[PDB]
Paper text:
Here we report the crystal structures of a novel transcriptional repressor [name] and its complex with the regulator resorcinol. The [name] protomer is folded as two domains, the DNA-binding domain at N-terminal and the signal-receiving domain at C-terminal. In addition, [name] is the sole TetR-type regulator that has been identified for regulation of aromatic catabolism. [name] is an all-helix protein and each subunit is composed of 9 α helices (h1, h2, h4–h10) and two 310 helices for h3 and g1, a stretch between h1 and h2.
The crystal structure of the apo-[name] is solved by the molecular replacement method using the N- and C-domains of res-[name] structure as initial models. The structure is refined to 3.6 Å resolution and the statistics are listed in Table 1. At this resolution, the electron density maps are qualified for fitting well to all mainchains and about 1/3 sidechains, which make the reliability to analysis the apo-[name] structure on the mainchain and secondary structure level with some sidechains for a part of residues. The final apo-[name] model contains two dimers, AB and CD, in the asymmetric unit, which have the dimeric organization same as that in res-[name]. The general structures of these two dimers are very similar with a Cα r.m.s.d of 0.9 Å, we therefore use the dimer CD in the following comparative analysis due to its better fitting to density maps. The apo-[name] structure shows the similar general fold to that of res-[name], but the DNA binding domain shows some relative movement in comparison with that in complex res-[name] (2a, 2c). Structural comparison shows that the frameworks of the binding pockets in apo- and res-[name] structures are very similar without obvious conformational change at mainchains. In this way, residues Arg122 and Arg74 restrain the conformations of residues Glu45, Arg46, Val48 and Val51 via hydrogen bonds in the ligand-bound form but not in the ligand-free form after the 10 degree swing.
Residue numbers in the entry:
A (entry chain A): 32 to 184, 193 to 224
B (entry chain B): 31 to 184, 193 to 224
């Protein structure tokens, strides 16, 4: 399971998140075809772990750079912008949305806590207006997907449209989502 | 014929489980076999969606005969949403399109989609809203309805407040306009 993730991850960077079969994976992991079924029941099961592991690397990366900005509205925008500006570059990431269906839950498990973290912080600050830190937190993810699938057929027009939903002044919104974006790595 | 079929399936699925409603048992309804239909319709998935779009065009056409007659646009919208939310938590057939369909969003876009563009665009001219990508606004709205109804299936005023606060309505004035008396429909 250790390598098994990072095996299929590697076989996507330049092979399509959909052209990976156990045969290659198990071999990269260094286990026999009939042993993979001892660490992952399905194949959507592995692909999902490949996803979590991916969001998590950014989930971590975000924390160590963005919540280091005093304004809540920016730490949210910033993280969001990164997530969109990410799905556009990473080949592997593109596949996680316009292809992976658990794309929503997968996000509620890796960023869900982080999302509520920031939506709550910017709330107790009076910066945001939230009447359900969960619905706000889920729509911030339903949106993130639909916004990306569309964009894969903006990393600002989007952020700007989320801060808005979190109550921010329509105008002041597009200004924050449009500020210089710190580096994620 | 592609009328009786979608009806046939609704009863079955609404009472067996969308997941176990073969192309067979469905046509037996509108009396046909299994190999007969695969021809009429391309795949079972289409028919399932034919039931989806069709199940939306119902409440849709219906929501147009009412809500649009309202004055404030942020209401017509919020109101039309609060109605879509209610309907989901109210039907074994609807709350079964979301938590089970991938088209969830895409079909919602084809049917109610435009209607949401129409009303948004308008409130956008009345000065009511502050949208920047009418597309991104109409898709995020539905991607949110699904994402929200799903949570609420494991609140309609609360979601609508958000949906307005997203299109630009005053963060505060948002909830008032949401909590107003929701008119009847179909």
């Amino acid at each position: 399971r250790a390598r098994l993730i990072t095996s299929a991850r590697t076989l996507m960077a330049e092979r399509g998140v959909d052209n990976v079969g156990i045969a290659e994976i198990t071999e990269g992991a260094n286990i026999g075809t009939g042993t993979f079924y001892n660490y992952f029941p399905d194949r959507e099961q592995l692909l999902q772990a490949v996803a979590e592991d991916a969001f998590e690397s950014v989930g971590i990366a975000l924390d160590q750079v963005l919540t280091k900005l005093d304004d809540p509205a920016e730490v949210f925008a910033g993280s969001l912008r990164h997530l969109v500006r990410h799905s556009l570059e990473d080949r592997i990431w593109g596949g996680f949305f316009i292809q992976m269906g658990a794309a929503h839950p997968v996000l509620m498990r890796i960023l869900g806590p982080r999302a509520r973290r920031d939506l709550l912080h910017g709330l107790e600050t009076g910066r945001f207006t939230i009447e359900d830190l969960d619905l706000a937190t889920t729509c911030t993810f339903g949106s993130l997907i639909a916004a990306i699938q569309m964009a894969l057929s903006k990393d600002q027009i989007f952020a700007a449209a989320m801060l808005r939903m979190v109550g921010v002044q329509a105008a002041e919104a597009r200004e924050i989502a449009s500020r210089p974006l710190p580096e994620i790595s």
